[PDB]
């Protein structure tokens, strides 16, 4: 009455901190909103944070509740 | 509480202005005063700030904190804004409903020659 | 405060028939003369 399991969706992080990528490259696949938009980072329909422009990916924690932010410095 | 309940409404407006890197146009309402400031996208340095709490500007008006006082300082802060070449702004609601005194303040800035 | 959904009004002038007059704004209907006043209301004896 078991053994029925789904197939993995390949979630997680695609580019880490200090990595420079072009616009439209997917940064992080996630279900919830653990990583939020910083600078030059937009949020998709399914919480897919995508690179709006060029530059390096920065992982930062800001805010009153200290939410995680993904920001791109255009370098 | 009416103060901080209004503030969280304005937080949605303030997120869009700083994420897009756009200069905002903030306001603040008082039963007897009115306030309007121009704030740089840095978020901690304010460029142009003219209000009816100023003694040199409220003395030209009878009552401070009504539609005639908001329209007086709406034109006054806009002339100082165009002296710096500022032409790109967005009117922050600051939680207040855009019907009356806050609206009539912004039309005075539209009257002086600033579009937003 | 809001508009038009608070139970209706009808101005009358009333007076109790015991030597006491209570003439106020009210929302009864056409008019009414009261029968018992607070002065004759038995909470003393």
């Amino acid at each position: 009455r078991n053994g029925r399991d789904s197939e993995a969706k390949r979630l997680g992080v695609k580019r880490f901190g200090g990595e420079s990528v072009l616009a439209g490259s997917i940064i992080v696949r996630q279900r919830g909103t653990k990583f939020h938009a910083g600078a030059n980072v937009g949020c998709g329909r399914d919480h897919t944070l995508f690179a709006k422009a060029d530059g390096k990916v920065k992982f930062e924690v800001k805010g009153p509740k200290n939410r995680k932010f993904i920001s791109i410095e255009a370098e | 509480d009416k103060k901080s309940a209004r503030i969280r409404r304005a937080t949605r407006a303030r997120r869009k202005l700083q994420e897009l890197g756009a200069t905002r146009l903030v306001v603040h309402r008082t039963p007897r005063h009115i306030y309007a400031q121009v704030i740089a996208p840095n978020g901690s340095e304010v460029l142009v700030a003219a209000s009816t709490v100023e003694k040199a500007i409220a003395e030209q008006l009878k009552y401070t904190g009504n539609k005639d006082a908001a329209a007086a300082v709406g034109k006054a802060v806009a002339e100082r804004a165009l002296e710096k070449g500022i032409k790109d702004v967005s009117f922050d609601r600051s939680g207040f409903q855009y019907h009356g005194r806050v609206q009539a303040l912004a039309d005075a800035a539209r009257e002086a020659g600033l579009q937003f | 405060m809001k508009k038009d959904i608070h139970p209706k009004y009808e101005e009358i002038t009333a007076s109790c028939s015991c030597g006491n007059v209570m003439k106020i704004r009210s929302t009864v209907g056409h008019d009414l003369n009261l029968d018992v006043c607070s002065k004759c209301h038995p909470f003393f004896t």
Binding site: - | - | H6, C16, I24, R25, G29, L34, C37
Partner: protein
Amino acid sequence: AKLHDYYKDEVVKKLMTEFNYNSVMQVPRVEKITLNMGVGEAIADKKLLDNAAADLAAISGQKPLITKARKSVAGFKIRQGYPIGCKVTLRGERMWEFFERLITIAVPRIRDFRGLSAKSFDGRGNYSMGVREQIIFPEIDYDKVDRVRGLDITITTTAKSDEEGRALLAAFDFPFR
């Protein structure tokens, strides 16, 4: 504004000499009475509330107001979003004359009057009163009506303690039995 002028001069100088109020805002003030008639049994028929609103229809400016269900209860055969009762939130100027229509002339119209409770409080200093019926109001002529629907009225003042609000009640002829 009949007893409000009585409140502003007589009661205000009474209260500040009563609890030693060193501030003019420190004296509690009556602000709202909440007139609610939870008839309740209008789950199947609408006219048990519409006529209840029509029996309620004689207080403030205009058309009557009904309520909605707070949540779903199996015990009284109700679900979520149900017109169950009718309520009134009367704060401001128009609610002052309602006191004279309730505490001065409706009290002699009480069937078998003995005395009002003095231990019916919200804890903060706000009283809640209850009437068995509706005939004590002069509005109902007892001819076209068909019900004996009572209605809980809760007076919510700006009181800090219960006896401080009771001192306001004592200044407004409360029959403490």
